[PDB]
Design a protein around this nucleic acid. Sequence first.
DNA 1: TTTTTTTTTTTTTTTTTTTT
Lengths: 178, 122
Amino acid sequence: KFIAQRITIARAQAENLGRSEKGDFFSVKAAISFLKVDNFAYPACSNENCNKKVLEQPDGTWRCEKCDTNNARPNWRYILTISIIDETNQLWLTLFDDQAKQLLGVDANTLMSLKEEDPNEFTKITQSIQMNEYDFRIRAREDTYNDQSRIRYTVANLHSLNYRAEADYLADELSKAL
Amino acid sequence: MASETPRVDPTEISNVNAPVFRIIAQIKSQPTESQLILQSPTISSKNGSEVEMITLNNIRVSMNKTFEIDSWYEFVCRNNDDGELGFLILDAVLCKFKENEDLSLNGVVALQRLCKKYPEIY
DNA sequence: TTTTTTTTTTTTTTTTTTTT
């Protein structure tokens, strides 16, 4: 009793639609193509459930607008996204702190301190983690900033290492085809 | 090699005469190293298809190719066209999946069937 | 047996190995 059947990204835009306004994400099995080098982790204050992005006053220490505090450790949160490819479409997936932290197994502060570090192991981790296969739960929403609007996707979960269940499931689908 | 080497069922020895093919099945230990027992069931039990086991004669050929118990191996072999002899053991590839996990042979069987009905794709 | 609070709306991945 596991999740097996699913659809693709090409079938995600229009399949016998609609489905007018209603849906909640869905499961996707897709390989990872490339990891963007820009917009990895944005800095913020260290606390639980921080919705504010700290800025720099003419001080030199990070300052939060809503909650006044002195930030000793500028705790970073993952804004990093990834470029993925599937059986049909080539899409882009936006990962959160837990999703991107679970992807490479490295936190945001250690990743930012790893990039600014003298050794080149940052590019070694970036190139070693890229080009893999992964499973996500992706949802689609349409947001508009000013003059530009398009549908974007996010990652609600990560799953991998499943092999036997997919092979036996496809084998059963082959046996039930007759 | 560079030629076509599809995966065929060990019971197809009567269909094709002396080809070069690869087999993925279960390896059993004989009383001697000159014989081999290949356990290859098919899908469901009571559906009408049962376990297909084929015995081969290893003789002295491929001494270092001896198979480990419970391990999997890709069998590169050529059938003998004379008689009273199984598939000649030539090459073997180490085959295992993961730790604390196994693999069902059904997905393999459906493999070996499809490549029989569709020679275009392997 | 699955229900948001951490940005901005682009995004480039391998760019050099090869006959007459």
